[PDB]
Structures are given as structure tokens and as C-alpha cells.
Paper text:
Herein we present the development of a PluriZyme, TR2E2, with efficient native transaminase (k cat: 69.49±1.77 min−1) and artificial esterase (k cat: 3908–0.41 min−1) activities integrated into a single scaffold, and evaluate its utility in a cascade reaction. The reaction proceeds through the conversion of the β‐keto ester into the β‐keto acid at the hydrolytic site and subsequently into the β‐amino acid (e.e. >99 %) at the transaminase site. It presents the typical type I fold of class III ω‐TA observed in known structures present in the PDB database, and it contains the characteristic pyridoxal‐5′‐phosphate (PLP)‐binding domain composed of β‐sheets and the catalytic base Lys289.
We aimed to crystalize and solve the structure of TR2. The obtained crystals were optimized in 24‐well sitting drop crystallization plates. The TR2 crystals were phased by molecular replacement using PHASER in the Phenix program, and a model calculated with AlphaFold as a template. TR2 shows an asymmetric unit of four peptide chains building a functional dimer. The TR2 monomer is subdivided into a core domain, which is the PLP‐binding domain, and a C‐terminal subdomain. The smaller subdomain at the C‐terminus consists of the three α‐helices and β‐strands 8, 9, and 10. TR2 showed maximal transaminase activity at 45–55 °C, suggesting that it is moderately thermostable. Interestingly, TR2E2 was designed using a site where a loop was missing in the crystal structure of the original transaminase TR2; the loop contained one mutation and was modeled with Prime and refined through MD simulations.
Author numbering:
A (entry chain C): 69 to 459
B (entry chain D), D (entry chain B): 71 to 459
C (entry chain A): 70 to 331, 333 to 459
Write the structure that this text describes.
């Protein structure tokens, strides 16, 4: 999560370090380090602090469920996720994510989790146009609910784009469908802003870009641009008018939670992410330069895909582009290209054969072309150590 | 004064380091490199963000450890009633607090609880050497119910900080040592709270002399200044996890946080040099015990107990005749504010008054908080005794 | 006197050793399994088994396969009632709301639970029955709401729990249950093994209480105790679906059961012509009821309930103040004996004396058991009148 | 001719054995006072309705056993895939035959499966001695996967008749007893089909020489002529269940059905004195096996296996190359009418022709079924001669 938890500045920016008032709660004598703002998606005006997006996802589940329990349905209790999707490392987070190394047959998905098709087009959609394999994938949802029990089901999770497993930007019509089905069946909606978070793309959160209107959302990293461990959980007023108009087991966080020192920070991080307007140099100014400069796989046979939006991007290491192929072991040519990316003058990752980039937001127009000819020199390069190599 | 230990304020730590985000690449100043102080047969260490994330991850390990030996059916762990071990779903299911588990969602599968050694509220007049056993043996009666081939460990705070105090009689932890081996299981001890000079020795384990194989630390690691969670390991558990690891081959070497680290990294470095660990249990603690053993003739104080650098006492109706209020907490907390609004830091679960002072405390300071609460114990005596009880 | 058998006490010659006892696979021999539609209203198919146990067991896989082809493989769980006997098959022990068969957690199995019984004499002391019938009926709505209308698939229950002693619901009970199996849109299976074939004033107990179940199972009463055989009847609703794309239960309707069990194929016909249920229902039953309903002046009897061809009465220490003994069971079974040894065949679930006589019974044969039981009342009334009981 | 065992038809029996249904009160002619013919260490039995309801009461008892030893967790039982262990939700779950489970309502919690020793449906090339070893060890690999103290029993017909006749090779069953004696579990074998009166002895348990701790019987007890189910028990399992009893304290004082017991009683008292079994396994058997083994040069058959009184054989499309059809059953069943429309009785599980004749078979009759079977095979062979199949 290097350069992806960091969501604003490279280095050398200074901050209201050491508050020196670090414990919490209790009668007077403080300075109030947790009175933060709402550049939030329009209808969200409460939130809940924790130790991480991993210590975040753990509490959403007691949330979504306490909710439906106090409305009369101690059964609307399951939640739906997707395969190959990162959703935190907390055993909850593990149950929530459809990665194969968390579950490992037993242990997880603990009671109350199962996973649906994830909209990965280059490798789960042969030639279908994009507008439908986002519909298909979106309806794959409704299948799982009529295959479970609406009065069993409680909400649906999803990062706006699956980062941590190779960018799975959704075909444009995925989110629009998902919008109806949450209204036709009437359940809840939580989005994971641990990644994406405070900018990383066109707008602030992934909500307003893709417009969606989540009942809840965690934010964690990027709140401090990696600078601090702070776990966030923003709620919607519906969800809120239930846990709070009827509660007592959750009248303590909104009374006190989180750590003053990690908060007192992000206040400036957002308060300095605002004015200077990176959010606007990032979306109306510097990003249409990354994507027009990215996606230029041009004539790189190893690349058969090249994608991205806003401030993140990726592309897939194939063997050939006539047949849209992958290597027999999709991961040897990827895991041996990272080093050829870090050992040449640029930082990049690759969940398998998918070189993934996620750079921060102060970037200018001149430090862009660099990680173009840096990777173009790492991409024309890994095109001789795998061909010379027999694979 | 609980999450923190030893350093109220005025102390300067390596703050603004301004090299902060490091996951794989060099820990700039290697901030993740700390010290195996007095863990002993515990020489490796795993980082998180808080204890809630520690006790969370401490379960994926056990269930991973055993399965590599051939026993994917040894999974269920066991805890204790009124014992806190986090607030994350693994931790909320592990802790013995009923006001978090509601209609199935907690406890998760592979969790159950046992009879907690609360001799005050659970033991009439039985000799502590006895109650220590039956509440210890209350474990063995929970393993045969399930099967020594289904159990995968037993956790426990050395003493329950978050459920008042709950000292185990001397005879408790002695037995536990026997059962945990007679049935071949692992012992993780909750250290987050008792950790770090909060008792007489470094960790709460050395006092009671046990040799756990995983402990979770947090808060105490930096005396409250920074969020972080820690998880410890035995030369054992580690060897096997690494013998044929994989998913976990990425922590002891690239985990935790570069900033919070160096801070705590300063926190302990100064607890050593300045020898607070030594001023706390050897010099001052006994005065604290010796002087907190003073319930005397307060019809409200009937129990008085303490170990190292922490203590408590219970509120009642009548001292000699066994009797307690008709709803402690309607009378305890109403004494909590009577300690702060008089001049002393004191939480109240509702009737078991507590004291969690830092390690730099001084005799005079000892004397100081005594009369101040005697005033608060002279006062609340008629505040609620003056009423119709 | 005796259950399972519902017709002819002894010496009635059926069509025995018909031999040719092969069925099903080859062309049939003489059509053993072809039985009458003698008043099930709209139920027009049937499935066969070996006994009540081996019957209800097959109603689950059916029910749960019903919704499984309407598009809701999750209406899988079913409800039943306490102090009810629905077989000794494992699902028959789970469906039966009796604790003495629920072995551990293995019994009851997933997808079953239990609700209040309309036992107006043990659950209700003086409450108005109608409301007691309404609530204990409303106790279902609660459970479904306690489980989830899209989790529940149906509900079973005995027209009168002959196994739970005898538990006639208040007149307002079932009329409300009719509504709820629609309010939540679900099925309704009734158990007629005991109540089936007379036993009540009508044929089944459905017809008496006026209802329309989706399936019902019968046994014993079919062969009047003469042959092992179990029947599981079905509605023209549930049917159309199973055959609309059959495959798993297109097997029995076309062929299942047992030839020689067609014995009952004459147990009903010879129950039809002679008009036994006829005279049984309209002629002899009303005589019996008003007469058995005569606790009169018997400090042992204070409840007196009877229906169709079946009744009971609870035994009591003192009825001026409604009472039971200090051990209902140490004394009740001390009278059944005092019935047979005195000359009448009664059973006692513990203090609730029972009777279920075959349907051929006559008028003059009514008074005979009466004084005789009375002769067992006055006796048992005073034998323990001298003890320390 | 599967369920039934001896006496093709026309043999008369003590039918009309009076007409009763007794239990607690006195009885006539004793009733269900049957015999003990070569079970050996078995001297008890629990009478049942059908082999479905038989294999269902061997499970509560199974667990009720380990319960009363103090192991409430030894709940599990291990079966074998493609095995017919009843239709009762226990029998259908225990049975390793998919199509009975339905993915949701079965398998009930607490049942998994292993591999079946199908030497020619899988592993026709490995030396039989080893495929028996692995096929046996296949049990340990799932007990080292569950919990040697979670597991509670292994259920295996001597041979899977419903699945054809997949006779376990020689080395399979020796290890099974070694293993069953190692990990501390019981042994339960379904002698319903196989045993009672087929094979080379009464029950097959005497042929393979194993010491079953539990045994169901049914069907062939009456040679079909009545519905009956039986649960034979081991003095081991015995000294235990009745000591407390509970759900089995008295059942042996009365159960079953007087009439289905009076019948079979003769079926055993007559199968002895007429020496059916004796001639069955000594004289009339080895001539049959010697002759069914004659797949000779039939391109359709590739193996000819059988043992005692029962056999079958595999159909294919080439032999030297053992190639099986692209969808056996589009061709197996198509050879089943080709024996009824010629004059002999065979079932086909999908491509395997099973033969299940009775014990009163004669030599001239043996020779009959042979040339008449060959007429079929030689009839069944011309019908494809290289279709597009």
C-alpha cells in the first residue's frame, strides 16, 4: 500500500505534530482534536473512528446488523461482496474479501459471507461489449439475493474500483444497475473508500464521480495520506436515525473513539488538501494528462490492455494480443517486471500479470512523462527477458 | 492513565520524523526495529494498529499454526467472563462482555467463555486456594465438553483490567499451567493493559511466572502517545509458522508503522535508562499496596486488593454483614464523580473502585491520593447513607 | 382403550395371504395400492411409507423441495409444537416438540423449532380460552417474525395432541392458524396418524375443525393396527408443482408403498359400507361426551375434555383450589394400573388419564367403562387420601 | 429379487398369527421372540419398520453411546459414496448416493463422505492389493481431517448392491478393522441387502470376518413377505446404552410388530431346517460364480465380478481397451428390457448388469440364466455395432 495509502503529498510537508493532549474523553481540559468537517457525499453527516480500514470493516458489520435488528429483522444479517476483492485484513475484512489466501477453505467465509462474480473484463468477458458485462455482473448480484433471502440480506459492499487486486474499473453500466437493485429489493449500501478515499480520481470520493449515495463508507487511509493510522466509518442519516434514535451500545463512539493525535493531523491534511486545491489540479488539471499519457500500450505485444481513470492506472502483461492471452503462470512475468520497475527508476506493483500504478496528487505535467519512459523502458525491457526466456 | 503508563506529560519523543510511509522499502531509520527486553523465549514480534487489531490477527495465527501440523479441527479458542480482549469482531467475540453480543452475530464460531475468578462477587467464603482451582478447573470442564482435539488455545488477561480488577487467588494461574499442557494447547496472555511495568516486572507475565507463546501488546507500547498494536510470539509458534509459512512471511520484516514505532521506540528506551520499571515495583509499588490496604472500617469498603502498580476496592451496604447495594453503579459511578469533583482520578464499573496510576509515582504522591479519596470515602458514606437505602 | 387401531377390537377377517407380494417395477399384479378418495376434500394424490415415523420423515424432503421449485430454496425451515409426537424417526424426534427425545444439540437438527402448545389446562390456569387460543396461535406469527417469512416453509400440528395427553385447542385456536399460514404465505401440513380415520366425529380431524392442509400423513389408523403402513396425502396444490417438472417424487405416486399393506385397502371399505364412522360420529359420540364429561363430584377430576371419539380428564390433589401433586407422575401411573388391574385400559401421561376406544363401540358399552373408571376414581381418590401425598 | 432373499413365491407362513398390536400389556405367543443365527458377538436387536427407519435409529444410539461415555462431541459418522443406506433423511444423508441429498436440506450437519472401492469405475489398472489399501486408508485421511475424537463411526455395506456390486478387493476390510481398532470408533455394517441370507454365509460379516459393533437389518428378514426393520447390537454397545437407558432402556421389552415378526420368524425357522443357506453357500453357489465369471469374449463386458449369492458385470464399447460409453444408461437400461423381453431378471445401475437371485436356486436353473443371459449380451451387442455413440 505504498504511494496508495499516501493520498496527497510526497514528503516534506509539515503538520500540527505532537498535540501533547493524547488520551481521550473525560471532563474538561482538552483542545478538541476530533471536530472534523464534511466535504462528504451529500446526505452523509456523521462518522465513526477506528484504528484502520482493517479496524474499520470490523465495526460496519456490527453496525449494519444492529441496524436491521432494531427494525425487527434479526435476519437481514448477511452481506454480499465480490471475488478477488480486498476488503481489509481484520478477520471480518478477511471474511468480507474474496481473496483466496484469507479464507483458505475453512475458517472463512465465517458464517454470513459468500462472494459474487467480480467485473474483471479482460479475463472473465471474452469479446462482450462493456455495457453488458457490467449489467451481467450487476445482475449476478440480484441472482445471489433471490438465491439467499432478501429478508436474509442486509447490504452490499464494493470499492468503486477494485484496487489491491489489479484495477477492476467497472464497465460504465455496472454502478447504474447496482443502483436500482439496492432500491428494488431495498437493502443497504456501503462503499470502501480505504483506497480511493479522499481524491485519487476525478472528484473527492468515488461516490460523486459514479454518483452513488452510500448508506455508509469507510475511509481510513488517505485521511492522513498515509501519515497516520486512522480508521474511518462515515454513516448516512437513515442508518444513523436508527442506531442513535435507538441505541445505547453505540452512544459511546459519537461520544468518544479514535485518537486525538491521529485526527488533529488529518484535519490539516483535508484542511490543506482543500484550499491549495489539489482536488482540482488533480481532477480538472493533472489527471487527463496521466490517462492520455497512460493507455499508450501502442505496440507492446506483452500489453493487451491499458486502463485507468483519475489518479490510478494499470495494464495487463499478456503473451500475445491476437488471442488476448496470459502467460501459463500469470505472475512470473508480472512479479519479474516489478523489480524491473523498481530497479529502473519508478515504483509500481502487479497483483499477478497486472502492473498497477497508484501515484499521489501534487504530481505535475513533467514528472508524468518520466514514469512513462521509465516504464516504457521497463516494458520494452521485460519484453526480452521473457522471450529470450522460454515462456 | 490506563492506555498510558509511566509518562503523564512534559516528555519529548522523536516527533516529526518526516519519513513516514514505508511498507517494503527501507524503514528509513529502521523504525520497526525494537527490542526483545524481558520477553525471554519470545524473540519475534508482530505489529498492528491497536489491540483490537492484535487479538483479531492473533486468531488467524493459531488456526494457521495447528493446520500445518495436521489438525485443521483444532480451532476453538476460549476466554473468560468479564474479561476484555479488544473491540474488533475477533476480540468482541473473545471478550466476556454481554452488552456487545446480540442475537447470534457474536460470538463468532470457535469461541466460548468460562467461569471467571471473581472471588468477591462469585465466591461466598471458600478459601482462595480452593476458588482458584474450581475457576481454573472450570476450564478443564469446558474442554472435555468439546474435545482436546477440537481446542486450539485459551486466552486470558493476567488480571482483568476492564472488568474492575479481578485478582486470581494465588492458586489459579498455577493450575492453568497444568491443564494447558495436560490437554496440549497454546496460551496467549492479554498484555495490552497489564503490559509494561503496570505490574512490578516488565510484563504482567513475569510476576505470575508463565511462559506464554503469544501475547498482544498495545497502548503501553508508547504510553498512550501513539496508536499501535503489538502481538508477540514464542521461539516455538514462530519456528513452525516459518518452517512452512507463506501468507505470514511478511510481518516480522515488513509491518507496523515507521512513525508510531520510533516514538514507542523512544518510550521504552527511556523506561530502561531511567529505570522506572525498577522504581515502580521494587521501591514504590509496595508502599502503594501496603498503603492501599486500608479499607479499614469503611462500611462501604469490604474488599481491598492489589498487585504491582494497580489496585481497587469494592463498595457495599454493610461491611461485616454480607450485603451490597440494590444496583451498584447507581451508587458506584455516583462515587466516581465524587472522586473527580473532589480531586482524584477514579473510574467505577459501578461498585468496584479502581486506581491505575503511572509508574513515576512518589510516596508523597501516594499519601496524596489517599486522604483525597478518604475524603471521597468519608463523604459518599453519608451521601448514600443519608438516603433511604 | 387403544390407539393406532381405530376400528374393530379383534376377530375381523381381512383378505389375508393374498400373496403375489411384488410391486412397482414390472407390470402390476392386481393393483394393491389403488385407494379411494373417501373425503379428503381437495387432496387427490398420495404417497406411501412404512409407519408414522417413516412417514413424516418424507414430508420434509417434500415440503423443502416444494419451495425449491417455486424459486425460494430458503423457505427451508419448519415449525411445530411442544408436547407433540410426530414420529420417532430422527426428523420425527426433531419435529416432535418433546424434550425427552431431543438428544443434545444433534437433536433438534437445523431448520426446526418449537412453539407454545394450546394446553389450556397446564399452560393456562384461568385465562379465557379464546384469547389463550388466539395468543398461543399468535405465538406462530411471532416465531416466523422471529425467523423470517422468507425463511419459513410450513407448520405442522396434531388436530388434538393425543400424545401430549389430550390437548383440544380452544375453538378460536385453529380458526386463527388458518389465517397465518396465509398472512406469511406458507404451507400447512396436519398430522392425522392418530386423528386420522374417525377418532373424531368425522373421518379425519381436518374435516372436524374445518381447514385445508397442503399435505397430511397417516399410519396405523389406516390398517386399524393390522398392518405396518404409512400414508402421506397431498393437496392438488402441492401436487401440480411436483409433477410440473417431476423426477424425485414422480417415483412413488407411480409406485411406492407395499402390496400386503393394501390390507387397509379393505380396512376402509369395510369401514365405509357398514357406516361405522357414521354411527360413530353422529350417534354414539355425543352420548359419550356429555357422559364422560362428568367429573361430577370427583376431587380427582377438575378438567373434563372430549371430542369425537377421544377424551381425557386431568387428575388433581385438591380441586377446590386447582392443584396437582408434588410429583405428577408418581401418582398418575399409580392409577392406570388401578385401571387394568381394576378392569379398564387407560394410559396416563403422568396425571392426565386418557381413553381412545375403537369406533365400533356401542351405547351399552359406554356406561360399562364409566362406572368402572368411576370405580377406579372413588378408589384411587381415597387410596392416596390416606397417605402423606 | 433384491430385498427378498429366499423362496421365490407360493411358500405359506404363519399368517393370521392372531391379530394384535401389543406393547406394555400382556401378549400372545410371546410375539417378537426371534433367534440369533450366526451374528456371534451380537445378542440383542431393536425391531423397526423399514431399512430406512432402521438405519435411522442406529444413529441416535450411535451418538447416545459416546454421550454416556462422556464424549458429547464424538458425533460424526463416515460413509462411502454411491452407497444406499436408506431413504430416511438419516438414511438419505448417510447414503453416499448423490441425487438423494439435494444440496440444501441434506446432508444434515455432521455427515461427510469418502471414496468407494469402485475398482473398475476408477482405478482399473492399479494392482487390486493396493487399491484396497488406499480405498481403506481413505478413511484415516478423513479422520485425521475431522477429529479422531470428533468421529464416532464408519458405515459401509459389505458391498454396495444399490451401486451394482462393487465388491471391495481382498485387502479392503482388513485395514478397515485395523483402522477401526486404532482411532477408537465403532463399526456399523448394513447387512440389510448383502447379509441376512446371501453370499457364502448367512450375513456377509462372516465371509469378510469382521466384528461389527452395530448392524441394521430389514426387508430380507421376511424374504420380502412383510415390512420389517432391525437394528442388531453389540454387547459392547450394549452394556452401555441400557445402563442408563433413556431412549433405549426398555424398547427391547417390546417393539416391532407382532405380525411382521410372526411371519419372518418362520422365514428363519424354515430357512434353517430346509438348509437353504447350507446348500446356498456350499453347493449351489460356487457353480454360479464359476459361470457368471465367463465374460469370455463379449466386447460389451470387460469384467465379470461376483461373490457368494450375488453378481453383476460391466458393459462397455471395447474391452482390450476398456472403453466405456459416452453416457452409460443411454445403453445400460436399454439392455434391461432386453432381459425381461427374453425371460430373465436383471437390474442395470447405469451400465452394470446386477443379478440378485434367491437361495433356492438349482443347477439346471443356474445353467438356464447363463445361456439366456448370453442370448441378451449377444443380442445387446448387435444393437450398436459402432453407432455414432
Amino acid at each position: 500500500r505504498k504511494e496508495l495509502a499516501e493520498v496527497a503529498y510526497r514528503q516534506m510537508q509539515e503538520l500540527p505534530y505532537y498535540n501533547n493532549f493524547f488520551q481521550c474523553s473525560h471532563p474538561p481540559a482538552i483542545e478538541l482534536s476530533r471536530l472534523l468537517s464534511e466535504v462528504t457525499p451529500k446526505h452523509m453527516n456523521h462518522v465513526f473512528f477506528t484504528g484502520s480500514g482493517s479496524d474499520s470493516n470490523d465495526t460496519i458489520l456490527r453496525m449494519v446488523r444492529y441496524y436491521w435488528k432494531l427494525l425487527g429483522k434479526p435476519y437481514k444479517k448477511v452481506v454480499i461482496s465480490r471475488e478477488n476483492a480486498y476488503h481489509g485484513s481484520t478477520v471480518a475484512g478477511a471474511s468480507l474479501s474474496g481473496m483466496k489466501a484469507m479464507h483458505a477453505q475453512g475458517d472463512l467465509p465465517i458464517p454470513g459471507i459468500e462472494h459474487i462474480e467480480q467485473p474483471y473484463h479482460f479475463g472473465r468477458a471474452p469479446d462482450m461489449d462493456p455495457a453488458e458485462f457490467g449489467r451481467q455482473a450487476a445482475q449476478a448480484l440480484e441472482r445471489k439475493i433471490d438465491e439467499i433471502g432478501e429478508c436474509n440480506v442486509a447490504a452490499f459492499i464494493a470499492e468503486p474500483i477494485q484496487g489491491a487486486g489489479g484495477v477492476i474499473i467497472p464497465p460504465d453500466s455496472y454502478w447504474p444497475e447496482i443502483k436500482r437493485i439496492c432500491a428494488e429489493r431495498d437493502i443497504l449500501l456501503i462503499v470502501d473508500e480505504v483506497i480511493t478515499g479522499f481524491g485519487r480520481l476525478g472528484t473527492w470520493f468515488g461516490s460523486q464521480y459514479y454518483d452513488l449515495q452510500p448508506d455508509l463508507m469507510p475511509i481510513a487511509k488517505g485521511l492522513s495520506s498515509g501519515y497516520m493510522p486512522i480508521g474511518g466509518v462515515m454513516v448516512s442519516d437513515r442508518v444513523a436515525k436508527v442506531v442513535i434514535e435507538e441505541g445505547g451500545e453505540f452512544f459511546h463512539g459519537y461520544t468518544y473513539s479514535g485518537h486525538p493525535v491521529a485526527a488533529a493531523v488529518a484535519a490539516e491534511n483535508i484542511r490543506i488538501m482543500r484550499d491549495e486545491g489539489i482536488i482540482e489540479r488533480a481532477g480538472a488539471e493533472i489527471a487527463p494528462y496521466l490517462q492520455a499519457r497512460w493507455r499508450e500500450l501502442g505496440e507492446h505485444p506483452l500489453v493487451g490492455e491499458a486502463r485507468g481513470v483519475g489518479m490510478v492506472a494499470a495494464l495487463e502483461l499478456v503473451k500475445s494480443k491476437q488471442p488476448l492471452e496470459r502467460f501459463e503462470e500469470p505472475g512470473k512475468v508480472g512479479s519479474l517486471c516489478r523489480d524491473l520497475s523498481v530497479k529502473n527508476g519508478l515504483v509500481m506493483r502487479a497483483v499477478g500479470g497486472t502492473m498497477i500504478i497508484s501515484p499521489p496528487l501534487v504530481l505535475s505535467r513533467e514528472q508524468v512523462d518520466e514514469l512513462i519512459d521509465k516504464a516504457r523502458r521497463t516494458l520494452d525491457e521485460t519484453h526480452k527477458a521473457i522471450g529470450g526466456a522460454l515462456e
